[PDB]
Swiss-Prot record:
Fibronectins bind cell surfaces and various compounds including collagen, fibrin, heparin, DNA, and actin. Fibronectins are involved in cell adhesion, cell motility, opsonization, wound healing, and maintenance of cell shape. Involved in osteoblast compaction through the fibronectin fibrillogenesis cell-mediated matrix assembly process, essential for osteoblast mineralization. Participates in the regulation of type I collagen deposition by osteoblasts. Acts as a ligand for the LILRB4 receptor, inhibiting FCGR1A/CD64-mediated monocyte activation. Secreted by contracting muscle, induces liver autophagy, a degradative pathway for nutrient mobilization and damage removal, and systemic insulin sensitization via hepatic ITGA5:ITGB1 integrin receptor signaling. It comes from Homo sapiens (Human). Residues 4-93, 94-183, 184-270, 271-363 form the Fibronectin type-III domain. The chain holds residues 906 to 1268 of 2477 of the full protein. It is linked to Glomerulopathy with fibronectin deposits 2: Genetically heterogeneous autosomal dominant disorder characterized clinically by proteinuria, microscopic hematuria, and hypertension that leads to end-stage renal failure in the second to fifth decade of life. Spondylometaphyseal dysplasia, corner fracture type: An autosomal dominant form of spondylometaphyseal dysplasia, a group of short stature disorders distinguished by abnormalities in the vertebrae and the metaphyses of the tubular bones. SMDCF is characterized by flake-like, triangular, or curvilinear ossification centers at the edges of irregular metaphyses that simulate fractures. These corner fractures involve the distal tibia, the ulnar aspect of the distal radius, the proximal humerus, and the proximal femur. The lineage of its organism: Eukaryota, Metazoa, Chordata, Craniata, Vertebrata. This is Fibronectin. Expressed in the inner limiting membrane and around blood vessels in the retina (at protein level). Plasma FN (soluble dimeric form) is secreted by hepatocytes. Cellular FN (dimeric or cross-linked multimeric forms), made by fibroblasts, epithelial and other cell types, is deposited as fibrils in the extracellular matrix. Ugl-Y1, Ugl-Y2 and Ugl-Y3 are found in urine. Sulfated. Residues 2-267 bind DNA.
Amino acid sequence: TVPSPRDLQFVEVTDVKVTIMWTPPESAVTGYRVDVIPVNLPGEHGQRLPISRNTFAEVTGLSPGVTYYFKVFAVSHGRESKPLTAQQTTKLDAPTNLQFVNETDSTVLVRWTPPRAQITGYRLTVGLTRRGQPRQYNVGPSVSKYPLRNLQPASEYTVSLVAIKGNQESPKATGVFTTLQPGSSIPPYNTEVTETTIVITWTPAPRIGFKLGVRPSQGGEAPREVTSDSGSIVVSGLTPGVEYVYTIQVLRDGQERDAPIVNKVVTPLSPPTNLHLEANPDTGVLTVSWERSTTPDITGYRITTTPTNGQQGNSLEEVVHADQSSCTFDNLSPGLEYNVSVYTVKDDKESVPISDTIIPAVP
């Protein structure tokens, strides 16, 4: 009979990571192994951590806003103790890429990318950067844009947006914008950002054009700056996962007669490509491999397996470092269909996955 550890403590709790530590039993122990199991959600994925002599464990690759069981087993003489078990809910992740479109000198359209967690609403705060207290707006959980009105012209505003889920609040997404000078008419424009492009679109008009500059906010790449009267400018060749300052300036009769509009955005992470699944019927292990993501400075990859038949409890995931272009899954039922997905991971951010299905041949 192996005595169990004691006093489970939560050292770090973020949206994607939980660090736990515990007190050893008063007996000689080979090491500890940690299981992480979702409490309520069947679509979520668990993890099994290898044995270690450390009295703490850092668990990453968790889903924001999800409750997990954390179970610590002591190991001795090849036998395991009863688990030391505690529950923790991860925090919410913040909305990303607050974007602003100037419509008039008093109206601005706010846009953003919703967080990964399931939410019940947003709290949107907008106020003059250097004057007074900001207004607050209650925003619904399904929307990704909000119109602002009665703004002071030629004035800089500070904007914050937090996601809400019941009593839980995410960290804030922040941004700044400056309204147009009074009475100024700019053609209606729209912006979109992808992994490698920043695009501006508008309806062409005689003697009106746009200039779009893009440069990395942290430096490291040469700046870009091009113009067009065609109604669209596509700046491609950008690096995924990088913060870019992009500047828009209207051109009237080929001349710059209005102040430039300054914006900031982070390009989405790029997924891995060329996913391959190979199942060995004689050993029972599945090998997953991919071509590295084109995103530099990622933190790793997250690999999930899910049976396509809605089964529960057979949903494990693996987190690997960025030098790994492969991983293996051991106990998958042969003859059954599994969906395997691989995500590029950078801190609490993830790419869209690359996915494929496999039927392990039952020997």
